[PDB]
């Protein structure tokens, strides 16, 4: 009961800068330049791990200790998201409220780290990130809540195999909730200069880049593994594993490509994300 979640967390950690690298090379190719390689994010992260972390005199243990906390919280997230089966490796932790409030832990620690430094830019970025979390958390909660009451249980691996076997009788509540979750993922992976990491340096900046890449992995993974499960397993076997890894990495790659495309193709989607979420909620109530 230990090996599968641990290997899940380790692989999802070690594949995260592929998704950042493919996103930045996609943004480079979209702006008609050759751009860096897909492994450039690994080179940047390892090189920053080589460098030594500096900070202000007023900064204490929070400034140094935040990036490890955010990486560990993203790991505790990623160990309960199903990427190859329809069953989560840890069904005890794989709830809906648990994942949301662990993301709240990540937001809280990022905000207090931004406020720990005396820089106005980091505190401003902390406030904007906390605003983003306030506006995105109930959208995604209502999306997976509509999907959960379609399913019957407040639990990942129940919503996933409910949408795996499409019932064809409550299809409109499923589709509207799916599009609301897509909008919430679009808001979280994007906005919807100086930056909020202008005081981080060295190993701390490297572990922040680790955490940012892992957060961008797990948000898209919570979308495409919970709501796109056709290609996974009901029970874990040792022969159909390669197909599951192939379809998982293909899903993640096409997800970051299309999100980069529609990000460069740009409170409309903020209201429409709420609007498609309530259109899902009314759909069960009317029907």
């Amino acid at each position: 009961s230990v090996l599968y979640p641990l290997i899940q967390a380790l692989v999802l950690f070690a594949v995260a800068p592929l998704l950042s690298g493919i996103t930045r090379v996609a943004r480079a190719r979209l702006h008609n330049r050759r751009g860096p390689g897909v492994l450039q994010e690994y080179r940047d992260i390892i090189k920053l791990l080589g460098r030594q972390s500096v900070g202000p005199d007023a900064s204490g243990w929070v400034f140094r200790l935040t990036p490890y906390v955010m990486v560990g919280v993203m790991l505790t997230i990623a160990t309960a998201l199903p990427v190859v089966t329809v069953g989560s490796p840890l069904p005890q932790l794989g709830d809906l409220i648990t994942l949301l409030y662990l993301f709240a832990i990540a937001r809280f620690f990022f905000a207090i780290s931004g406020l720990d430094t005396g820089s106005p830019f980091t505190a401003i970025g902390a406030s904007r990130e906390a605003m983003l979390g306030v506006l995105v958390e109930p959208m995604l909660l209502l999306g997976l809540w509509v999907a959960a009451q379609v399913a019957g249980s407040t639990n990942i691996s129940n919503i996933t195999d409910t949408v795996y076997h499409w019932p064809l009788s409550q299809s409109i509540p499923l589709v509207l909730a799916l599009c609301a979750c897509a909008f919430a993922t679009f808001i979280e992976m994007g906005k919807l200069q100086e930056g909020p990491l202008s005081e981080y340096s060295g190993s701390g900046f490297g572990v922040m880049k680790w955490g940012i890449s892992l957060k961008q992995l797990v948000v898209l993974q919570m979308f495409v593994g919970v709501f796109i499960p056709w290609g996974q397993m009901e029970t874990f076997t040792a022969g159909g594993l390669l197909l599951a890894l192939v379809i998982a990495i293909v899903k993640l790659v096409v997800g970051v490509l299309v999100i980069a495309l529609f990000e460069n193709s740009m409170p409309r989607i903020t209201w429409a994300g709420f609007g498609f979420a309530f259109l899902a909620f009314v759909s069960l109530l009317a029907a």
């Binding site: 330049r33 751009g35 981080y200 900046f205």
Partner: protein, 167 residues
Amino acid sequence: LLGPRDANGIPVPMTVDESIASMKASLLKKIKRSAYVYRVDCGGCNGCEIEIFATLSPLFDAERFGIKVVPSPRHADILLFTGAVTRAMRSPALRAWQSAPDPKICISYGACGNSGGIFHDLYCVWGGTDKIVPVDVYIPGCPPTPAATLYGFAMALGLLEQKIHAR
């Protein structure tokens, strides 16, 4: 306070510790495949600034060699100094120097940054950028062509070697 001075109070270039300066070659071979460069524009004309920003343009690219421009000195491994050190600009340039994590690489860009250029003996400048901070690589020109900027960064990262010598 920020920088060392003489008995008269005139600023002198900083002296890094040799413990700090001992691992510059290891830092160079570490950042050979990925260099984080922060432009520190001082008292200079835009020529020596727009051409540095044109190193990531369509004609000449820097991310293909690994060079990425950073928004903060804390992210910087290479501190690119541009203009002649104006008296009002010595303190912010020094602050950008101490904000970066040790060890650092400093590249002087342009005639005005190397020695002051046409303003070398003037009351409001301190001369070149080597009069306030140590400089590892000197890039001449007024303005330096993007080929010269790529050659300077490649020679700083060890991809190329120095061509001209003293006569």
